Structure formats: C-alpha cells, structure tokens
Amino acid sequence: ANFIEKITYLGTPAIKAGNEHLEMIVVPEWGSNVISLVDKTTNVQLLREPETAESFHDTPTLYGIPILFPPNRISDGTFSFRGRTYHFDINEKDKHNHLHGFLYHEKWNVVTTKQTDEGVIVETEIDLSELPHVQKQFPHHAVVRMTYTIKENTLFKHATVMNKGKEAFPWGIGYHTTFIFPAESSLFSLTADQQWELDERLLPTGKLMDVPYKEALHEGMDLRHKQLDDVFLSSYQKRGGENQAVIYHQHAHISIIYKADEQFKHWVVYNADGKQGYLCPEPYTWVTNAVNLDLPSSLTGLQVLEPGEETTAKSSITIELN
C-alpha cells in the first residue's frame, strides 16, 4: 500500500508520500527539503521539524534534509578552476567564508510523481541558470534533480547533477540531514578512521589525523560531553566495506542506517553545543574547501562535469527495528 498526497505544511505547499513502513514530506519551495520522515511501525518522527515557517526561514540548514550545493565552506568565497577565478558570496562573516551553497532556500519544481508495487517516487529539480544571483557567482548551466524513492523500509535519496552548458564546471554536494537525537539514550556510529585537521575558520589545513575515539565511533557511541563540528574521511576507499552513519535509538529500538555511495568521501558531524537534541551526520562528495586544497581528487572528492555530462550520487536512509 502506498500513496502520494499534496498537503499544506506550515502554510507552504508540500508533497506527502509513503508506504506501509515509511512516510516522508518534501517541501519543494523550501529547497526541496525532506522536512519529515516517520517510521510507521513505531510512529516515530526521525527528523527535526520546524515549529513555525519563520523558524525554518531563519535556519533552513538545521531542519529536515537540506541540500548543500556545494557543501560547507569555501575560504573567502574564492577559488580557481582551470585558470578561472570564482567569487561566491561571503555569507559566513566572522570567518570570511562562503558557506553551504546555492540551493537550500530556493524553489525547486516537482517533475515526477509515480507509484508502483515496487516504489513511491517523487522527483524535484532546479535549473541554476534560472537563478540570476547564483549565475553571478557560478555562471554555469547546472541542473540538479533529486529522486526520492520509498521502497520497503528505505528512503533512497539520489542527486543527479547535469551540465547543460558549454563549459565544464567543478561541483560537490552534501546534505545537512538533521535527525532527532536524544544524547542520553541514543548512540552514533560512523565508517571513519581519520579526520581532517581544521583551522580556526573550520577549513582543512590539509593534514589528516587519527580519530582518537574511532573504536567507539565504530561500535556506537554516546555523544554526551562531545561538541562535534568535525570533517571525517570516509574509510570506504581505504578499507572497502561500508560507507554509512548509524543512529541507534535505544528507547525506540530502532536503527537509522544512513548509507552513501562512493562519491561521498567525507562526512561532517555537527551537534552544535550538544544540548539541542539533534545530530547532523552530513555526507559530502567533497571535503570542506576542496577547491582550494592542493591534494588529489581521490582524496578531496572534487568532481568536474564536462558539457553534456551528468552523474547520479546516491544515498539512502533505512530504518530497522532492533
């Protein structure tokens, strides 16, 4: 059994979709944010939802599943690529950075709604050539299409990035996925052994370091007394195996398994002061400030789309009852 339904969410049009296991709400006008994800077996909301529309507009990267194109910081908003210098707006004023890209608070179009016995599918899309202020910063005909598919106990969340223009461009994507996380009774794990050393502007120095608590991080750990805003290197390319973050909710007896494909070479983990009741395990295709690191792209995750090319970067959220 399954459904797709147009609804109003905090005064804004939205799409509710689900099956017998999982229900999502995506808000196309709000950066195609998947604002709600409910496990129907347990009736548990998994994502942090805003309590007013104004609250969402105040902090649109701290609710639901915000789309970060590109993710995290670029020093001084400035980088060079094939001889061309780019200047993105410096929205992080104290650290003098560009932060979190172009798409989390723009209107995306709904382009597909389909249901079968195999999956419920919603696709949204945005064409950056239709955003004049973005074109000032990033003058490329980039198009991003999100494919959300609910099948059994999984939300598949795929991003297809397309170059419809006449010149190549560099790109990365990430998500600022904001899960409810009661630190007194949930545990967190991640496939990472190393992390990037950061400077005072939260930019990588270029050095990798051991994660001191990596064993605990593999096992599932208590994050009480830990403030995280850390850039982890996925262990997948070195060790093979999995590329995923897991939240275990001990009271609800459910595990959230957040998988990402090989493009997602880094994870940022953010929990603010640790007392806000949420946790953001953020898979990124490129490391913070990738465009300004003199390191190979196998490590930074920097990607380039030539004219006419596209690529699909895949991730998924699976809910398991323990």
Swiss-Prot record:
Q: Which GO BP terms apply?
A: galactose catabolic process via UDP-galactose, Leloir pathway; glucose metabolic process
Q: Which UniProt keywords apply?
A: Carbohydrate metabolism, Isomerase
Q: Respond yes or no to whether keyword Glycoprotein is given for this record.
A: no
Q: Which domain of life is it from?
A: Bacteria
Q: Catalytic residues per the record?
A: H176 (proton donor), E282 (proton acceptor)
- Residue sites binding substrate per the record: N72, R73, D229
Induction cue: By nitrogen or tryptophan starvation.
Q: Name one Pfam family in it.
A: Aldose_epim
Query: PANTHER family under this entry?
Result: ALDOSE-1-EPIMERASE, GALACTOSE MUTAROTASE
Put simply, this protein is called Aldose 1-epimerase
Q: Which organism is it from?
A: Bacillus subtilis (strain 168)
Its lineage opens with: Bacteria, Bacillati, Bacillota, Bacilli, Bacillales
**This protein's encoding gene:** galM
